[PDB]
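G., before I forget:
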Amino acid sequence: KEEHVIIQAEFYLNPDQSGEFMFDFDGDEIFHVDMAKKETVWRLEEFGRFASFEAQGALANIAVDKANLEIMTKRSNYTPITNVPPEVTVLTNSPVELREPNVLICFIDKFTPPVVNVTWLRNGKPVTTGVSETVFLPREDHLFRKFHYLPFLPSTEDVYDCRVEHWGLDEPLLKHWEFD
Amino acid sequence: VDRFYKTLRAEQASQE
Amino acid sequence: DTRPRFLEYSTSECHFFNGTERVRFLDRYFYNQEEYVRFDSDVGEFRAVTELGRPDEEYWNSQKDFLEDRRAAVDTYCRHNYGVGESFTVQRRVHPKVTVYPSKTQPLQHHNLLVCSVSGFYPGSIEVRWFRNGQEEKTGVVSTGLIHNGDWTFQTLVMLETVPRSGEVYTCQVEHPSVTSPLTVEWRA
Ligand SMILES: *[C@@H]1O[C@H](CO)[C@@H](O[C@@H]2O[C@H](CO)[C@@H](O)[C@H](O)[C@H]2NC(C)=O)[C@H](O)[C@H]1NC(C)=O
Ligand SMILES: *[C@@H]1O[C@H](CO)[C@@H](O)[C@H](O)[C@H]1NC(C)=O
Ligand SMILES: *[C@@H]1O[C@H](CO)[C@@H](O)[C@H](O)[C@H]1NC(C)=O
Ligand code: NA
Ligand code: NA
Ligand code: NA
């Protein structure tokens, strides 16, 4: 019976002292707040033309989340988080055609704490050109989702890897992709 | 016309 | 990093039914993996999900200005934010890219696959149908389901298990709210 769902997801993590605030609509990030810059960062730039958000509201919430973390850590008798490793899926935006621009999607799902190091590897070498990513997106439960992108020109020669680093994994997880 | 997203304000937890 | 971690996570969820006629506001609080307390607009007060949320249930319900703020959220927060983004979220319409290609069987089976890839569309609600000489194929249709791309677009691969015989015309039909009449891509052996 549910039509749409708007979620305001926020977190604070210790000892990292890192926070995040974002709005989600049906599984898609509408925007997030850049904690260092004190700026609203829209997922699609057209969103900023029709709507606005005061970044100060997010930062004021983060100060409360930090204070609440301090209280909850004490209340739980200083119980740390149990790391849940992620499930990583590598796919394309559309079917693959040689010499026609496409996008590689790295989907990282069902994990906690919301901390990852994601590197795109072209022939075992790191690539940062055109790369984009979502923030840590909410799920129905206590776990997190994340999407990473790499726009590429398909070739028979070139091979790809998504290297994901998480504290729940004994070794950095490498999910491979290649033509046919 | 308000075209601004509203933040749901957070409150400090119980210290007890 | 080996160092232990402590996480405070909160989700303020607005669930909409029949536009904004029926709204369900859910203020959830999590510590590590544990949801300890929550405010349900249907309940009308804070309730402890676990033992750890008991001091917050007692305290937040006695905080009258905070409890009234949460009770008014369905209108002042939920319905408000629905209207702010309505034109580019709820009413967002991105037309699909329909690609039909034959595929190799894994391994050598009696039937070969005919793939109908539907990509770059919004919203998620879609109807993808396979046709064999004007007649709809209901058996031998395999789908990967709805794939969310995380960039306000979706994709789906709808396969047909068939034997390319006669000189037949295979047709994939796509129906999506972003298009007025169904979209078709014809394939012949
Ligand atoms: C992400 O990357 C950084 C390194 O650039 C990781 O931090 C290092 O973790 C190791 C523990 O084995 C330490 O030796 C280093 O001192 C850390 N370096 C820095 C600059 O902090 C970090 O742990 C990685 N995050 C994840 C989730 O794997
Ligand atoms: C913390 O320790 C005390 C011991 O007196 C106990 O009452 C309580 O169960 C513990 N709390 C948790 C969340 O384990
Ligand atoms: C949706 O809301 C309107 C309010 O006037 C009502 O007429 C209609 O019956 C509702 N539709 C459904 C499916 O509940
Ligand atoms: Na605006
Ligand atoms: Na705002
Ligand atoms: Na439809």
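Residues 1-80 of chain A form a domain with the Class II Histocompatibility Antigen, M Beta Chain; Chain B, domain 1 fold (CATH 3.10.320.10). Helices of chain A lie at 47-50, 55-75.

More on Monday.
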